[PDB]
Amino acid sequence: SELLVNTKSGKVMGTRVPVLSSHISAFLGIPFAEPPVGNMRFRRPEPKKPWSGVWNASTYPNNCQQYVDEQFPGFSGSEMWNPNREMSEDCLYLNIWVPSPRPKSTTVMVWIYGGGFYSGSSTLDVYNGKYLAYTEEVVLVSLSYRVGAFGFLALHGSQEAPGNVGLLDQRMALQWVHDNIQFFGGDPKTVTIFGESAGGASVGMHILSPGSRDLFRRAILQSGSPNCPWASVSVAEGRRRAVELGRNLNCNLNSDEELIHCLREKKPQELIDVEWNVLPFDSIFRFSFVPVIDGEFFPTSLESMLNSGNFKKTQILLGVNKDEGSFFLLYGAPGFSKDSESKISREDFMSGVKLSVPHANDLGLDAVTLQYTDWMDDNNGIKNRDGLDDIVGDHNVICPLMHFVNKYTKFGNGTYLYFFNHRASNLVWPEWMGVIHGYEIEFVFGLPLVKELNYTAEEEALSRRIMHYWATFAKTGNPNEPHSQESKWPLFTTKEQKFIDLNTEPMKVHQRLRVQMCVFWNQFLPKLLNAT
Amino acid sequence: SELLVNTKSGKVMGTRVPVLSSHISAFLGIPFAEPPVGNMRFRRPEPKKPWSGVWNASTYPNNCQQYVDEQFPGFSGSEMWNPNREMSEDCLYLNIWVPSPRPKSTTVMVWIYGGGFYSGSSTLDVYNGKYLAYTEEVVLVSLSYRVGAFGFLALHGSQEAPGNVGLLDQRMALQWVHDNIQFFGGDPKTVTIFGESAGGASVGMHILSPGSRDLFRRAILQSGSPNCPWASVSVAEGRRRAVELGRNLNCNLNSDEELIHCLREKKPQELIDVEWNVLPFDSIFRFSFVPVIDGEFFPTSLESMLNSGNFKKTQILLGVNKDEGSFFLLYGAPGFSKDSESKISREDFMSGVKLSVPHANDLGLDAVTLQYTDWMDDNNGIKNRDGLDDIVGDHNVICPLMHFVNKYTKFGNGTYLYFFNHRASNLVWPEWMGVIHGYEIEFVFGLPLVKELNYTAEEEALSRRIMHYWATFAKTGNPNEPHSQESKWPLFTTKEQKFIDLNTEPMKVHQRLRVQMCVFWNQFLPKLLNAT
Ligand SMILES: *[C@@H]1O[C@H](CO)[C@@H](O[C@@H]2O[C@H](CO)[C@@H](O[C@@H]3O[C@H](CO)[C@@H](O)[C@H](O[C@H]4O[C@H](CO)[C@@H](O)[C@H](O)[C@@H]4O)[C@@H]3O)[C@H](O)[C@H]2NC(C)=O)[C@H](O)[C@H]1NC(C)=O
Ligand SMILES: *[C@@H]1O[C@H](CO)[C@@H](O[C@@H]2O[C@H](CO)[C@@H](O[C@@H]3O[C@H](CO)[C@@H](O)[C@H](O[C@H]4O[C@H](CO)[C@@H](O)[C@H](O)[C@@H]4O)[C@@H]3O)[C@H](O)[C@H]2NC(C)=O)[C@H](O)[C@H]1NC(C)=O
Ligand SMILES: N[C@@H](Cc1c[nH]c2ccccc12)C(=O)NCCCCCCNc1c2c(nc3cc(Cl)ccc13)CCCC2
Ligand SMILES: N[C@@H](Cc1c[nH]c2ccccc12)C(=O)NCCCCCCNc1c2c(nc3cc(Cl)ccc13)CCCC2
Ligand SMILES: *[C@@H]1O[C@H](CO[C@@H]2O[C@@H](C)[C@@H](O)[C@@H](O)[C@@H]2O)[C@@H](O)[C@H](O)[C@H]1NC(C)=O
């Protein structure tokens, strides 16, 4: 049968799924590691002990234990991101969508979910790999990994909670793909990893980590980069938070051995309930448990690694959305709300700024405010709203991504850069939020092809055009077809720094993506804070 | 006779001078103080001992001892600013242009020359008071004052060189006008002081100094303000330079009494020859001997005086030219020259910046460079040239003037603000220099009325229009005629900060003159340098 597959872990049985007047195969919830339960909460993952018999992979696995957004109960725009299955600590599985008939040795795409390292699910509707699998004849995998404290509690020195274990979950799934994807028609030497937000940063982290580089061929990074200020902490900061988490559960803090035991005794919701109370600053776009710079997974600081060329040299394709900041301002900044235009008083602007740049002193906060205020018109509430949207997006996503790109491009084998600025016609979030963190994903996964979802024709076109760039790039390391008669996404070079915007208009090429602001965030502001 | 006049100092005899198909009276070189020669070099001025007999005031007096520009020997554009009479330490005189027939009690305008407190002459062609006297039926006075070390060597504590004595020369001339101008038809209670550059700052200084406030009624400040960073130093900095000047003439530096004696023994050119070698920084738009903040002439710091309202409350009219920086860049910055377009390499830009902001550390220099560089286009030599022109103008003239205006306007009785941006059609300096420091003066003094000088008709019109604003303002404290049917120069208010541009176009009103840059120079940058 097309749906029975023998792998080095055991036989698996998939399921035939419909997709756009046709059908394909899917293998859902295949285990790649031992459950990380009990005395193994916080531990490195162990490889899954192989099974005799037939693993029923006809239905999605559990999502990992995570915080669940109840800010807009019922609202599709927010629930679409929440777990759609029972949560459990038993959650390390992957899902595979394979063309029909099964190919022999086609391109593989492995999706790594975002969600700030504290949430995410491999099983969400907007991550359904079938439209991509089917339209580009690729094998589309999506893995899962432990988020929150479960994935990222770091007590450096201990082996019981060494930190980074969620990145190790991802790595193990990548090992498994390397070792088994051929049984499904996949070419293990044309594996592309791709990801959004923390997934984007994850991908970049796998490019940096020596122990992950050999497991894949190329990378796509969407709206995330491993050097993002939210994406990692020092081992000391990790420790501080591990401990501080202890204190909120009246735990014994006298040794690592003592704390971890105490933390392992707790129910999962008891950890989720107090996870946000360990952040050292009142802040947005900061997350409690995240990768740590340990000297194991990351042998030195990211910045030193990037200067010296210590990373996988290959092709990458990456970029950003127009209004990355809006989602976090909505959820965490005073003045902003879903059902108004959220025009913003001076006073709430300055509140915004302090929240957006938490590590900054008063001189720093002034420098940021000077950069982003039109002083001819300092009480326009649209301008203050839009200016804060830009501050958050620039500081957290765009400028760090641009810094990664420029450093990568000195040593790599080709870089392709996009700026996604299309607001979907059927978006249910308000207009002021613009082109939002995460809303390119649905184009990448082909959802505008499903008539019932109410995209325009131009939007179906753009999705097809993007699915092709992604798949073609994953196949050849270039998103352009060889001699096509459409216009060419130029390569990004150190000298000229070209990129394209992705939307329904005729493709347009520009150069030096947000360079004015990024010189501020990447050169000036850091200098300013070092001196003071 | 119309040309014989009895004053409290003696009888004076003027001279009938032609002006535009008519004639008027002029009294040139009337002494207002004892020569400041010998044991009186560096001293407070003493009032001129009255004379019996008739003082021949038919010809211009000597100009004061000053440095003489030989950068462009023969070139009209530069020689027009140099002394046109024998220089001497005997130089404290004034000049008076009176309508024919002599009026009884008309408005008086007293001009104070600029030239960085180190040069200037009351007798230059471009300061000929006759066109104004005649066209607006005002009595136009122009005084003179000691520049350089002669005017400004400050050894606080000594009475032999107390500093500020050149400002005291101006004050004495103003005393004399107060006491005698009525004999010439002048109304001593409608005296307007007006000045450019250091003269502008002088005027503002007379508004601040309690001992000068009662001697005049209103003020016009052109491209200068008493808070300009070049316009004054502390008594310690004054001392340091007084001394350092000693050292360059192998003077005995053991006491004030010893140094001054030694400095009084020297010929004037011996002081001029080494005057520039005492500046503490390599710099432009900085001048060696300038007013000092002494607690006598200025009872406290300018900034504290301005916050507390300690100054003359009256009407003022003031403003700036478009390209104030260009003249100093030409004369003192590498890359810039008279006969090319002076496009400017990155490397010469950064040299520019260091020169323009001499008191600044490296973090400061970065902050300035960030503010003024288009990072999309960081090798456009026109943009780097123009950006440096703006840095110098903004930091030295515009932003300090704007800070003065906003502080004055909280406590004063009306403020009128202009932005002069007309490039004269017959300018002999190159185009890149733009609208240059000092080149509104010729409009204010009516030179575009003389056919032989080659102004267009539109330029004659603008000059008439400006002469009228100045004279009407000096007469009533408002530059507008009561019910005229031309458009009104609005008042500058704290709330709305309106100003007009002065040129050949239809008058246009705007608001918040260079406010983006001036928040940088007046708030951010000073904070930045205090913290570091
Ligand atoms: C991604 O990586 C691959 C390689 O890992 C890379 O392809 C390489 O491109 C260069 C282009 O310079 C090729 O180098 C040349 O190859 C020719 C033909 O064999 C040689 O004759 C060349 O030497 C002559 O010409 C040079 C002028 O170009 C002279 O400088 C020289 O003195 C000789 O006269 C030269 O070695 C190279 O062959 C390929 N390699 C492969 C495997 O194709 C590709 O460019 C990379 N892409 C990016 C975007 O970084
Ligand atoms: C694609 O576009 C179409 C057309 O624009 C769109 O169809 C709309 O879908 C919603 C489904 O949510 C329909 O709204 C419901 O209509 C019924 C009958 O009149 C009401 O009872 C419903 O109200 C209940 O639920 C509300 C919460 O939403 C409660 O507030 C309320 O108290 C009730 O319990 C509800 O309004 C809507 O009528 C259609 N419109 C049309 C013209 O068909 C479709 O959803 C789009 N598809 C996608 C996937 O977005
Ligand atoms: N946690 C609170 C504040 C808080 C602080 N302490 C707490 C204690 C208990 C409960 C809450 C708190 C807070 O500010 N949460 C913001 C994060 C909510 C998670 C939703 C993540 N889902 C999204 C995600 C993405 N985009 C989104 C866009 C919008 Cl418009 C909305 C949601 C998106 C893209 C990546 C995947 C997740
Ligand atoms: N003194 C040298 C450098 C120097 C340093 N050390 C020295 C030693 C000896 C000789 C020279 C030096 C220097 O940079 N000088 C610049 C000042 C020259 C004075 C001319 C002042 N005249 C002007 C003045 C004004 N505008 C001008 C516009 C232009 Cl384009 C040209 C001249 C203008 C307006 C106010 C009146 C004076
Ligand atoms: C495999 O399982 C399919 C769906 O599983 C569903 O959930 C599990 C936990 C059970 O409760 C099961 O009864 C549910 O159906 C079944 O539809 C399918 O029949 C099973 N197939 C095979 C080959 O065993």
From Swiss-Prot, chains A, B:
Phenotype upon changing residue 197 to C: Loss of activity
Consequence of changing residue 197 to V: Loss of activity
GO cellular component: extracellular space; plasma membrane; side of membrane; synapse; synaptic cleft
Keywords, sorted A to Z: Cell membrane, Disulfide bond, Glycoprotein, GPI-anchor, Hydrolase, Lipoprotein, Membrane, Neurotransmitter degradation, Serine esterase, Signal, Synapse
Tissue: Found in the synapses and to a lower extent in extrajunctional areas of muscle and nerve, and on erythrocyte membranes.
Catalytic activities: acetylcholine + H2O = choline + acetate + H(+)
Record entry for activity regulation: Inhibited by substrate concentrations above 0.5 mM.
Keyword Signal among UniProt keywords: yes
Record GO terms (molecular function): acetylcholinesterase activity
Quaternary structure note: Isoform H form is a homodimer; the asymmetric form is a disulfide-bonded oligomer composed of a collagenic subunit (Q) and a variable number of T catalytic subunits.
Protein name per UniProt: Acetylcholinesterase
Lineage: Eukaryota, Metazoa, Chordata, Craniata, Vertebrata
